[PDB]
Amino acid sequence: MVENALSQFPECMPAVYAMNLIGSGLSDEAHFNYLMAAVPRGKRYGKWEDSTEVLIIKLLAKRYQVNTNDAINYKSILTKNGKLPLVLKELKGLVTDDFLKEVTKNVKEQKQLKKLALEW
Amino acid sequence: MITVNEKEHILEQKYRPSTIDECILPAFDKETFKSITSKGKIPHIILHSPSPGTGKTTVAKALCHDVNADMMFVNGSDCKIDFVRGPLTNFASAASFDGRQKVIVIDEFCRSGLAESQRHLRSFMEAYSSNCSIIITANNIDGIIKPLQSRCRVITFGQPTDEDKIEMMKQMIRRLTEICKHEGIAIADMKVVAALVKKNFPDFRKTIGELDSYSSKGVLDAGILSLVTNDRGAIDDVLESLKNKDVKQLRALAPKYAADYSWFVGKLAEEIYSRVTPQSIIRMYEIVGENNQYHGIAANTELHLAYLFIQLACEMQWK
Amino acid sequence: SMITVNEKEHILEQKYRPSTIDECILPAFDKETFKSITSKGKIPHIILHSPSPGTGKTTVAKALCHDVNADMMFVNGSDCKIDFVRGPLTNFASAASFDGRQKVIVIDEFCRSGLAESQRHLRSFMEAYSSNCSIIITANNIDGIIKPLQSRCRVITFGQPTDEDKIEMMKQMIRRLTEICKHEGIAIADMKVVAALVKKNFPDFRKTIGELDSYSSKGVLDAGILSLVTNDRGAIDDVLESLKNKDVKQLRALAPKYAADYSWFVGKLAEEIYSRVTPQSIIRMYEIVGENNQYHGIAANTELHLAYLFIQLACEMQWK
Amino acid sequence: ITVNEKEHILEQKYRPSTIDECILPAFDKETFKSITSKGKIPHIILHSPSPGTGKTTVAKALCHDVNADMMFVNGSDCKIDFVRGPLTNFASAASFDGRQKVIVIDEFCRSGLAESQRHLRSFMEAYSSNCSIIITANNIDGIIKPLQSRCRVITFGQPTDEDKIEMMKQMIRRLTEICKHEGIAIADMKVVAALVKKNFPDFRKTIGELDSYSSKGVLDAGILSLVTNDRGAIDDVLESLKNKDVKQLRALAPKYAADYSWFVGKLAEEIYSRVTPQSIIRMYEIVGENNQYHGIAANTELHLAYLFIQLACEMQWK
Amino acid sequence: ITVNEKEHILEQKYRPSTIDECILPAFDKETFKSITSKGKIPHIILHSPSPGTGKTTVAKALCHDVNADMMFVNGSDCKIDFVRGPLTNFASAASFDGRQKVIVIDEFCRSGLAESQRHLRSFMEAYSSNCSIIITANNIDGIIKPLQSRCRVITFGQ
Amino acid sequence: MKLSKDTTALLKNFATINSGIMLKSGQFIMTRAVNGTTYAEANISDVIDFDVAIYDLNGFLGILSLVNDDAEISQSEDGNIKIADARSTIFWPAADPSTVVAPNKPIPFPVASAVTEIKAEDLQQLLRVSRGLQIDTIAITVKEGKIVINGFNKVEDSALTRVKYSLTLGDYDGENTFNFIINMANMKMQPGNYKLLLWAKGKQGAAKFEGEHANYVVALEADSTHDF
Amino acid sequence: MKLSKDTTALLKNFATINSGIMLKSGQFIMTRAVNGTTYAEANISDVIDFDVAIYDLNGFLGILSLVNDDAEISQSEDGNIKIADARSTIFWPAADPSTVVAPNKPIPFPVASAVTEIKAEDLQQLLRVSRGLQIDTIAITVKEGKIVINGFNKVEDSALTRVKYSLTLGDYDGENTFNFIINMANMKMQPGNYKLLLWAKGKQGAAKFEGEHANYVVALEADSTHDF
DNA sequence: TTTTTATGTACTCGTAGTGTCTGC
DNA sequence: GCAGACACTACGAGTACATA
Numbered sequence A: 001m002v003e004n005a006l007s008q009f010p011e012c013m014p015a016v017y018a019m020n021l022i023g024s025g026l027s028d029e030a031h032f033n034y035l036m037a038a039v040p041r042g043k044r045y046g047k048w049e050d051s052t053e054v055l056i057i058k059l060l061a062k063r064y065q066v067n068t069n070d071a072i073n074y075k076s077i078l079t080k081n082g083k084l085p086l087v088l089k090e091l092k093g094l095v096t097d098d099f100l101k102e103v104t105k106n107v108k109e110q111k112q113l114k115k116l117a118l119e120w
Numbered sequence B: 001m002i003t004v005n006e007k008e009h010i011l012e013q014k015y016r017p018s019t020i021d022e023c024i025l026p027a028f029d030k031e032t033f034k035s036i037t038s039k040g041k042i043p044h045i046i047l048h049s050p051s052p053g054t055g056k057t058t059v060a061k062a063l064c065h066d067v068n069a070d071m072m073f074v075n076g077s078d079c080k081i082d083f084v085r086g087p088l089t090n091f092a093s094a095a096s097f098d099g100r101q102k103v104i105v106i107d108e109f110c111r112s113g114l115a116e117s118q119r120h121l122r123s124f125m126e127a128y129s130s131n132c133s134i135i136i137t138a139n140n141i142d143g144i145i146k147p148l149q150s151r152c153r154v155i156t157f158g159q160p161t162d163e164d165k166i167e168m169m170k171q172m173i174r175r176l177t178e179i180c181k182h183e184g185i186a187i188a189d190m191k192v193v194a195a196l197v198k199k200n201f202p203d204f205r206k207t208i209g210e211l212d213s214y215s216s217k218g219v220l221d222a223g224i225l226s227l228v229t230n231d232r233g234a235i236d237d238v239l240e241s242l243k244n245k246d247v248k249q250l251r252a253l254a255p256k257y258a259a260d261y262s263w264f265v266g267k268l269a270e271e272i273y274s275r276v277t278p279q280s281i282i283r284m285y286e287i288v289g290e291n292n293q294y295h296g297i298a299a300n301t302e303l304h305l306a307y308l309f310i311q312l313a314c315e316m317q318w319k
Numbered sequence C: 001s002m003i004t005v006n007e008k009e010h011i012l013e014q015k016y017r018p019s020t021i022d023e024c025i026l027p028a029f030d031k032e033t034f035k036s037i038t039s040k041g042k043i044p045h046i047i048l049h050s051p052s053p054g055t056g057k058t059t060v061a062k063a064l065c066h067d068v069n070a071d072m073m074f075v076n077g078s079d080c081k082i083d084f085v086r087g088p089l090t091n092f093a094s095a096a097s098f099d100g101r102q103k104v105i106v107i108d109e110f111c112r113s114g115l116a117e118s119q120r121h122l123r124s125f126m127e128a129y130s131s132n133c134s135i136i137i138t139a140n141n142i143d144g145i146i147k148p149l150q151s152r153c154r155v156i157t158f159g160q161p162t163d164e165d166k167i168e169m170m171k172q173m174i175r176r177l178t179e180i181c182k183h184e185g186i187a188i189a190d191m192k193v194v195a196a197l198v199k200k201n202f203p204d205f206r207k208t209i210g211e212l213d214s215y216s217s218k219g220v221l222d223a224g225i226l227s228l229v230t231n232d233r234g235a236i237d238d239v240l241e242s243l244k245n246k247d248v249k250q251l252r253a254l255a256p257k258y259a260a261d262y263s264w265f266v267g268k269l270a271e272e273i274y275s276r277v278t279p280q281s282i283i284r285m286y287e288i289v290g291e292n293n294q295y296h297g298i299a300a301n302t303e304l305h306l307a308y309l310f311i312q313l314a315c316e317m318q319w320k
Numbered sequence D: 001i002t003v004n005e006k007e008h009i010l011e012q013k014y015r016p017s018t019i020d021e022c023i024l025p026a027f028d029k030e031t032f033k034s035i036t037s038k039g040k041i042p043h044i045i046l047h048s049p050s051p052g053t054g055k056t057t058v059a060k061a062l063c064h065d066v067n068a069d070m071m072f073v074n075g076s077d078c079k080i081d082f083v084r085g086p087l088t089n090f091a092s093a094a095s096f097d098g099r100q101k102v103i104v105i106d107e108f109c110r111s112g113l114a115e116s117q118r119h120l121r122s123f124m125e126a127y128s129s130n131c132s133i134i135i136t137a138n139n140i141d142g143i144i145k146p147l148q149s150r151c152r153v154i155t156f157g158q159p160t161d162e163d164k165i166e167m168m169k170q171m172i173r174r175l176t177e178i179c180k181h182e183g184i185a186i187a188d189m190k191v192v193a194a195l196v197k198k199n200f201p202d203f204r205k206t207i208g209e210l211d212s213y214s215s216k217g218v219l220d221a222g223i224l225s226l227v228t229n230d231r232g233a234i235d236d237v238l239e240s241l242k243n244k245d246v247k248q249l250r251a252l253a254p255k256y257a258a259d260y261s262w263f264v265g266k267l268a269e270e271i272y273s274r275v276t277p278q279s280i281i282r283m284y285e286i287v288g289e290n291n292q293y294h295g296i297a298a299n300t301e302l303h304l305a306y307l308f309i310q311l312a313c314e315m316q317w318k
Numbered sequence E: 001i002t003v004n005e006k007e008h009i010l011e012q013k014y015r016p017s018t019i020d021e022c023i024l025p026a027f028d029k030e031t032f033k034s035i036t037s038k039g040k041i042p043h044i045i046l047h048s049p050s051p052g053t054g055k056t057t058v059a060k061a062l063c064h065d066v067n068a069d070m071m072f073v074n075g076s077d078c079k080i081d082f083v084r085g086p087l088t089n090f091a092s093a094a095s096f097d098g099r100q101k102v103i104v105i106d107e108f109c110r111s112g113l114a115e116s117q118r119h120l121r122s123f124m125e126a127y128s129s130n131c132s133i134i135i136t137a138n139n140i141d142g143i144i145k146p147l148q149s150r151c152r153v154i155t156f157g158q
Numbered sequence F, G: 001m002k003l004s005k006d007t008t009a010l011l012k013n014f015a016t017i018n019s020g021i022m023l024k025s026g027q028f029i030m031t032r033a034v035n036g037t038t039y040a041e042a043n044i045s046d047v048i049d050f051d052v053a054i055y056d057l058n059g060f061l062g063i064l065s066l067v068n069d070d071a072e073i074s075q076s077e078d079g080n081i082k083i084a085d086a087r088s089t090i091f092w093p094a095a096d097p098s099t100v101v102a103p104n105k106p107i108p109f110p111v112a113s114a115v116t117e118i119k120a121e122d123l124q125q126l127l128r129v130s131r132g133l134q135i136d137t138i139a140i141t142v143k144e145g146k147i148v149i150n151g152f153n154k155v156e157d158s159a160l161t162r163v164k165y166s167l168t169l170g171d172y173d174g175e176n177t178f179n180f181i182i183n184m185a186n187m188k189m190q191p192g193n194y195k196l197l198l199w200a201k202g203k204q205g206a207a208k209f210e211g212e213h214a215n216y217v218v219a220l221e222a223d224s225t226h227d228f
Numbered sequence H: 001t002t003t004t005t006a007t008g009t010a011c012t013c014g015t016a017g018t019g020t021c022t023g024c
Numbered sequence I: 001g002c003a004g005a006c007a008c009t010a011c012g013a014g015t016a017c018a019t020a
């Protein structure tokens, strides 16, 4: 995490690139201590692909036993051709709550559980 | 003159204080305890200090003994949920025919997964606090949920002011004297006890123990003084040879630590971080972390460790 | 004379495990505080630690309990969970030894991190049973022992002797290994072998003994066996000249001579160049040889990566 | 020389049963034959980064030559509770038959089982009377140092030059026997020689290439061409840098990315004669640098292309 | 021309069932037919860094031409507890009609599967008599070298 | 379709082999293991009407465990399975038949190469001894004329050397020698009497358990040996 | 060599003291807890003919509850423990005796410092009240000239001040004053009339329970105060 | 002024379901 | 002649740890 937070700010990236290389097997206390004298200036700043698509992407991936990349492409071509609406119905039975809650717990996996319900 | 538990043999607890006035605390805290005992009833008190052996469990027991309280001592680790609802409630709701204040000491309460039992204790303090009070002794204060510190009087140990530290160490130098008087230890040099108290200060349990380990001769001559002042080593020879750029000793110390490479590289980073300049802190962790990254890829691990020594000598600007 | 054979053990390094505290090989002050504990008849809480393995910890623990004649409880720390601490250990500490021998618990290999809840419970455990029982802890990572528990014990750092103690410890370990060979019938043809075995495996005495068994396969510690300990695989000779005159025609055809002996050759090369080059060209040697050694393995052509070292050496070191 | 039958997959079908049948460096076998000579097996860690060296086979052969009560365990399944359970359950069982018990923990170099390793610390010293543990690992630094202390660390795949010659000769006679038992005719015998050298320390893939290269059913000179492959000369490569071109050397890398070690092992040798003397030190610095990182390099072909670009710049040539 | 008429995506519907039906270059088509002719399959890592070459189809084609009792699983869903449970219960038991048992691991070069990969070395040896494993790799370096020791590295030639 | 106590208990057994089941019109239910090691079949007394596939058979029986025995299991006009109670009413979503790996191929068992019968309390004692003795593999061979089942500790015992349990099941007549090794894990029959049928020829084989209601066909471990 | 159900009942009691046991040939058996906390010795009705060490006595008897009581036990050529039944046979592995902490010789209990005599039903009521009042440690001392037992709740009592029970036992004819504390967790004896022998010298001490067939040496507590 | 990603392992705790034993 | 209640197990949760 601590490296991936400075991964957004490119000015901190030289030290993050080093700890990526050689920081493996380096002490946690040493990791913070290296990044102490390594990051330039401070004044901590801001922060660091949607649900209803990411259920289909991960549902097609498990059905055809393909990877994210392949699953992502599957949908994009199916949105263009032979009814993605049909294959949505083909996969309404394997939308278990263990499947659902695994992606976005919060409160969406209940508005998503019975979201793909109405697909018949 | 010192309370002894003549069934202890272990020094570090044979002479554990009984009352507040026997304890060695900062004057304000020591006064705040004597006043808490004077007022009759003990409040909810959290005694904490990250540095161990400062007086927590002693003061917790000393408050119960001064007040002459019906004390229920419990190991905070066995203070699970079925315990707070069980023997804790049975005691809190017992009849105090004795009139003495019921007080429950939860020793070493700060723990990882005792969260549900911890919040139960807070809600327990809205029901049975009418009857009993609770003394908590913890090291990490954060291990304690915020509601408890909000209610309890949090007295932080082991964080004394300069003037408070000076008087406390002087009191402790007199304690170890009265220990050596009562145990049979000859104090040939008084600077031993002074250096004993000073070397490992806030931990009063540890400094009494160190006196036991240095009492192996039965006398505290200046040789024992030379022991206590001898700052030990760990890897003091490598740090020394790195500051001196002594290529000969780096060449001969690399076969010394190539056996336990992974420990030594971790111990070396820990030691140089204090001894080296800040602009060198960058090159330090880069040289070491890279050398450890290729550890095992390097065919000769001993020469690879000498490589680390040569690399540091050339690149470290020393303090 | 005093040397203990366990006989029931077949694996050498466990048969010749020291039985009493005098048979242990320890720094004088550390042996002085252990004899002091035995002469006091009572044992405190102690942590026997060392980053190096087999320094004496588990053996000194058992040896200290023997000389005290202690009702001791040997416990594998990894198997000592919080409930085992709440249970048989608390039921042990609260006993009253039927023969009065002071009780001791030996938590062997306790530097584990998963058993932190046991240590948190052990903070007030030792304090509640300081009479009757005491705990000897054997750890390898002291920082695995939580600083409160460290406070309750006498922390004795094994495998880290002062130089005057290191000399007397190797000297004892040599005389020990000499007596071991007598028991085992190993012929000490060259005493410098025993010294090399002790010096190379210090302060892991268990690995020292294990090395003796590994190399006593022939039953004789002859001069060829010393050349195996120091792995003195001869001199280099031909490479040194071919660098001193920068002979690349020979150097590139001489690199295959050590492709299968890289780790030794790299060590021997730096060992000889150290005395055969100018003072500040020594630091340039460890800079390029240490790098060449560090990148071996991920090197594609291990032969070519050795010739890379040769051409880099001949072009940067000036021979004194 | 001992067929396993049962299996169909050659390398597993011909795994040596005895340690004498094992082919491994001279001093290792003598330490192995001495261990079996003693009648009792210590704690051993057989390790080598190079796979298929015999570490597992030696362990199973060590218990065989001694008649040990061997319990074989996939080290990835050797969890702490598995050590607490079946391992103790088996080490504490009585050996009324006089057999010594040996726990063989195959592929026990994993990092997540460190807690299981740290339990074995005192386990091994506790049952050291009749139980012993053979550890087989690839990454030996994944074994905690207190266990390497308790074991006899025997490093495979690290022979002397003399051992390599005899071990290859021992693998030649073994392989031609594999072909006799399997029905594979050997025409050009030098094929079996190149099959052993191409994958030397990995004897598993050595047989794996034998099976793979017996697709014709015979080992003719055409099979030897298939084993030493490309070769020729680095001609077109050498005039690529000689012309300091554009796309020609860029698209030339994949033909030489596969045999990278040999390619660089002949590129620097051919170029040594025709690239000046003051750039003979610059070319070896550049080529050596690009060679020692060939492993951390992910795209071997791009690594070779990166070597070509910097060669085209810093080379004086002629 | 094989069609799985129950399929809705043309990639999965018109997947060649036979190694002949695969549109593959020479030497490869010669190699795979030689492998299926043996009737028994050794551990195969067929790999091609170019997508859509036929890694997955060939892996399934070899299982069909040899009439294998194939269990096809994606590497990402092939974790270590998956190997301990199902994959072991499969390769340990012998199929009722005999016939080769195969375990195809598609895209096993994924990074998180390093430790489950380390389980297979010894797994493949313990059950090599009854079951072989075909691994589909995109990046061959993602396969730990001890697995390449146990497998036949088929690289799709230019 | 109405689901009685004996049939739901069978479905509770078939759930252990496959997380779901596919069942078509009739009284014949069948499921196979995902890996293909344990095949179970059962003709039952309750008749089902339509064809349905249940992906979560475990959760399907749990939801059914609140409705009275009058449980009306019907198809929804759209397709799902509604459960009508004396008062309440539940809706369960049905799954596609290709989601549940179905046996689909109920080819009959061949000729029994060897025949014996194991009692209900004999299977009981085998499963209860293994629970206490940690027995993971059993082998069925012949000893002194009578055939026996031997249990081992495959993990604690590599090549099945030391027996930990042996149960005799009657005598063998023909002059054959064999040793069929079955994995205890992939052995998921429910308690009762089973006429043990054993078939094996060449390098293929299987073990069939003929219960008074259902049949269980498990696979034999590759290490098994026979001279058939 | 069959084991009667009262002998095994005594064995399942000994398993509470030590998870294993080392029993030699003869009619005499014994065990001691690993933490030197309790020691039990007993001669029994069956006869052991061979030395054997059992690493898991609890699981041994739990498995021995699965064969008929007529089961003939023996030392098999398979050098372990053979449990011959009517049809089945259990080969329980004999354990290396070095892994079983057992008393190498029976503890000869010294001359008793004080003698009383608990009754079986008095002991029974003592266990029932302890499970009801959370009584964890008890003390046997003198009260108005009589030997009594007093239980506490060391959790809530800590100092052991508030008495929670008083089983007035015998009368004391001596002049000594003792306060022997026993931990209830170390009351591993089976119910039955016992002659209670007490001994304590200096900082040592132990209590012995002489039974009609089984004797028990349970350890006293660190805080036991006496004037012997 | 921000707040999360994968796999595998080991341990503790709480509660809840299941198992073995007992009453005036 | 079974219930009760302790006794035991399993599992969800939360935790801490080591890797890439």
Ligand SMILES: Nc1ncnc2c1ncn2[C@@H]1O[C@H](COP(=O)(O)OP(=O)(O)O)[C@@H](O)[C@H]1O
Pocket (backbone or CB within 6 Å): B011, B012, B013, B014, B015, B016, B017, B022, B023, B024, B025, B052, B053, B054, B055, B056, B057, B058, B059, B137, B203, B204, B205, B206, B208, C148
């Ligand atoms: N303030 C103090 N004054 C005197 N002795 C102390 C003090 N603090 C600790 N000690 C010594 O340490 C032991 C008690 O440690 P304690 O403070 O109770 O543990 P912790 O501080 O870790 O809760 C006693 O035996 C006592 O001799």
Ligand SMILES: Nc1ncnc2c1ncn2[C@@H]1O[C@H](COP(=O)(O)OP(=O)(O)O)[C@@H](O)[C@H]1O
Pocket (backbone or CB within 6 Å): C012, C013, C014, C015, C016, C017, C018, C023, C024, C025, C026, C052, C053, C054, C055, C056, C057, C058, C059, C060, C138, C204, C205, C206, C207, C209, D146
């Ligand atoms: N200080 C020592 N003195 C004598 N022998 C030792 C010493 N340390 C280790 N050994 C040798 O190693 C073995 C002891 O190892 P041990 O101390 O138990 O390991 P660890 O210290 O890692 O727990 C003994 O058999 C002994 O031969």
Ligand SMILES: Nc1ncnc2c1ncn2[C@@H]1O[C@H](COP(=O)(O)OP(=O)(O)O)[C@@H](O)[C@H]1O
Pocket (backbone or CB within 6 Å): D010, D011, D012, D013, D014, D015, D016, D021, D022, D023, D024, D050, D051, D052, D053, D054, D055, D056, D057, D058, D136, D202, D203, D204, D205, D207, E146
């Ligand atoms: N030293 C050797 N001698 C003979 N055959 C070997 C040797 N090493 C490997 N093999 C071949 O490879 C297989 C053994 O590989 P193995 O030792 O199990 O790999 P690893 O050492 O990675 O465990 C055997 O089937 C054998 O045919």
Ligand SMILES: Nc1ncnc2c1ncn2[C@@H]1O[C@H](COP(=O)(O)OP(=O)(O)O)[C@@H](O)[C@H]1O
Pocket (backbone or CB within 6 Å): E010, E011, E012, E013, E014, E015, E016, E021, E022, E023, E024, E050, E051, E052, E053, E054, E055, E056, E057, E058
């Ligand atoms: N060599 C080939 N011959 C015939 N079809 C192919 C071939 N390669 C790919 N395909 C087509 O591409 C689809 C997916 O191929 P796949 O095996 O997934 O390749 P990869 O796994 O390399 O992406 C299949 O449905 C098939 O129809």
Ligand SMILES: [Mg+2]
Pocket (backbone or CB within 6 Å): B056, B057, B058, B107, B108, B137, C123, C124, C127
């Ligand atoms: Mg305290």
Ligand SMILES: [Mg+2]
Pocket (backbone or CB within 6 Å): C057, C058, C108, C109, C138, D121, D122
């Ligand atoms: Mg140890």
Ligand SMILES: [Mg+2]
Pocket (backbone or CB within 6 Å): D055, D056, D106, D107, D136, E121, E122
């Ligand atoms: Mg192997």
Ligand SMILES: [Mg+2]
Pocket (backbone or CB within 6 Å): E055, E056, E106
């Ligand atoms: Mg694919």
